[PDB]
Design a protein around this ligand. Structure first.
Ligand SMILES: COc1cc(OCC2CCCCC2)ccc1C(N)=O
Lengths: 195, 198
């Protein structure tokens, strides 16, 4: 059940599609980035069309929507990474098994592109090129994280297996989320940019 | 997509179903166990009906069947664990982040045994305070595999010049596999829980 805005893949299951500047989709994603990174330079934005990763993500979204008895389990967040990780993320998504892990041993996502834009995350390559994903994240019901978590905490220590979906640095005003399971994040766009 | 011979869970998402000796379903599991663990005695065998784990696993299986262009991707393997881990595995499956270092490490993942005797070691199926030992019977997407190495945190690439095209799992020995290691969530479905004693 592939999304209407994807473009045809001639019966293949993975494509990176460069967006056309000035069309609605490019403009929307560029605006999310420019909200906090207006001083950067965008080289290109690519849509990630990974049928398998999308399928697995959408199954987990449907499950989280049933469990939590609402929609509103998804957020659009940012993830800076090095050029050497991009091929893996495009094909396989985010892997906690692959910086500080102060809020747990998961994959980190920022609310603001400006945070992911730090060189510690979006490491510049030999030509100054930096890479950041725009990511659909199943944040669900979240709690404050802490060092050394391998999964989110339970919602009640009386039922130890009924977990929070994600953790954050601050529940009232989150700036980062950590997820601990495969297929809780779908890399939707890749932004290539410079300082 | 839930299997039609599961018990009706009346809108619930999770159930453990105690099997009856003399049913083919119980006897096939008992035989598979006793082939290498005839010195132990089974207390009970429970079918694990976990709707969400099943759905996610079956998606991964269909994907691996498409990618590998054959349906030889699934093996039925054993996993011994401690009583404290059973509630988590029953609900959430096998988490590599929680896995012990194996005494012979072929990678940092979740380990599954071909022989129940391996999983029956007290190091894995730690006896609880009542002397009960716990072993899962697991559908595992082993797919295409190679010999592992202790440093792996994912399966290795098939081709070093295409680092993202991975083996599905690793083993101790490709000619005579006795263990498999998987490195991704929802690559293993806990199907039965065997409770057993000396
Ligand atoms: C590991 O990568 C990140 C980590 C992020 O917070 C990690 C820090 C935040 C402050 C407190 C200690 C942990 C945010 C974004 C990314 C990212 N790749 O964009």
């Amino acid at each position: 059940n592939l999304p209407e805005h994807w473009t045809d893949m001639n019966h293949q299951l993975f494509c990176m599609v460069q967006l056309e500047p000035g069309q609605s989709e490019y403009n929307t994603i560029k605006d999310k980035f420019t909200r906090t990174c207006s001083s950067y330079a965008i080289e290109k934005i690519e849509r990630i069309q990974n049928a398998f990763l999308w399928q697995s993500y959408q199954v987990k979204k449907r499950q989280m929507d049933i469990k939590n008895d609402h929609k509103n389990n998804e957020r659009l967040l940012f993830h800076g990474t090095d050029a050497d990780s991009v091929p893996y993320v495009n094909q396989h998504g985010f892997n906690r098994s692959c910086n500080a892990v102060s809020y747990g041993k998961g994959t980190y996502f920022a609310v603001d592109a400006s945070y992911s834009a730090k060189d510690t995350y979006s490491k510049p390559d030999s030509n100054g090129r930096k890479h950041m994903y725009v990511v659909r994240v199943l944040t669900g019901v979240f709690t404050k994280g802490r060092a050394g978590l391998v999964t989110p905490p339970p919602k009640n220590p009386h039922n130890p297996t009924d977990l929070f979906d994600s953790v954050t640095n601050n529940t009232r005003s989150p700036k980062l989320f950590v997820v601990f399971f495969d297929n809780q994040a779908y890399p939707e766009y890749l932004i290539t940019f410079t300082a």
